[PDB]
């Protein structure tokens, strides 16, 4: 995202967001304006490829969604949410949507290419992050949720796989697939197993509190090297999540354990982020005592590590994926369903 009182700042941010939310950008590029180079990653819904824009020579990350698959997996409204929200937001730690368009067969979202790779790859390779390292990333997520939640937005898919490291060593949140603008509670069963809050699993109405729960799981995983609740099958994971019992590694500081006990708390009346002081309860927690919040926002804090970059189109920080031809039918598919995309 673009580089840099709180209430005043947020008021202006909401004004900017609403103008774009009410009148979304559309059809800002076309397929033949890019040369597709290689797949950077895939998920349950789309394929993200490194592409080069012909006229500018700039590299981007193009997310390709097969309309028919979107319908099959019942992600029509979710995908429309994804694009409408991403094109309207603006925060230092949110990936920027540069172009969006569609053709007979697919939907396309061209984002800034974040070359540092997924936090996931670095975390699994190194094993675990030191607490200062984990705290550096956590601070960026706390600020990002503060921003998103102020706009009545719930993210719903926080995980190392959806977090990218940029050239400066800072975080860039991607995959707004489950993002939604809602003022009340919502009920959709969505997210990723290890990060689902108890209320989602129990099919209960939930709110922004699930994002803070996810933050707790993310901090735990970053500092421990493994999730607080893991097993071989999702069902087994859900049973552990609902039990709520959490055990901490021997190296976790007392401050970190206290924070996690409050984030992964079953009592919503005591769960940090959803209390009277809201996000301030988190920002003022002892574990974040050394955190200079404004400096983080302004990206003035020294990053734990800067990813190795060889060139503008270097993809060495990403795994290799099997490639597939991107075909476009001569017949338009799901035209009316995605009219607003």
């Amino acid at each position: 995202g673009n580089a840099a009182s709180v209430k005043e700042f947020l008021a202006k941010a909401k004004e900017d967001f609403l103008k774009k939310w009410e009148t979304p950008s559309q059809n800002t590029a076309q397929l033949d304006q890019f040369d597709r180079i290689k797949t950077l990653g895939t998920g349950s819904f789309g394929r993200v490829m490194l592409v080069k824009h012909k006229e500018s020579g700039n590299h981007y990350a193009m997310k390709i969604l097969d309309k028919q698959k979107v319908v099959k997996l019942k992600q029509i409204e979710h995908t429309l949410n994804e694009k409408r929200i991403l094109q309207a937001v603006n925060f230092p730690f949110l990936v920027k949507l540069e172009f969006s368009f569609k053709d007979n067969s697919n939907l396309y979202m061209v984002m800034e290419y974040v070359a540092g790779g997924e936090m996931f790859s670095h975390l699994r390779r190194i094993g675990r992050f030191s607490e200062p390292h984990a705290r550096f990333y956590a601070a960026q997520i706390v600020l990002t949720f503060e921003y998103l939640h102020s706009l009545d937005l719930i993210y719903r898919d926080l995980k190392p796989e959806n977090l990218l490291i940029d050239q400066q060593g800072y975080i860039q949140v991607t995959d707004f697939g489950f993002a939604k603008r809602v003022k009340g509670r919502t009920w959709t069963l969505c997210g990723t197993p290890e990060y689902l809050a108890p209320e989602i699993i129990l099919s209960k109405g939930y709110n922004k509190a699930v994002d803070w729960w996810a933050l707790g799981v993310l901090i735990y995983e970053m500092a421990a090297g493994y999730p607080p609740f893991f097993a071989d099958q999702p069902i087994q994971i859900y049973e552990k999540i609902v039990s709520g019992k959490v055990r901490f590694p021997s190296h976790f500081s007392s401050d970190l354990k206290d924070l996690l006990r409050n984030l992964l708390q079953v009592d919503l009346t005591k769960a940090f982020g959803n209390l009277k002081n809201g996000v301030n309860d988190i920002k003022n927690h002892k574990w974040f005592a050394t955190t200079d919040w404004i400096a983080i926002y302004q990206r003035k804090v020294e990053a734990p590590f800067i990813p190795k970059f060889k060139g503008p189109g270097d993809t060495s920080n990403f795994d290799d994926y099997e490639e597939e031809e991107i075909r476009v039918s001569i017949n338009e598919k799901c035209g009316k369903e995605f009219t607003e995309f």
Partner: peptide, 18 residues
């Protein structure tokens, strides 16, 4: 150890959405 149990589990690779 918990770490050993995790590494021996079937979910140490990238996790896609439900």
């Amino acid at each position: 150890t918990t770490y050993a149990d995790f590494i021996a589990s079937g979910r140490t690779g990238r996790r896609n959405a439900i």
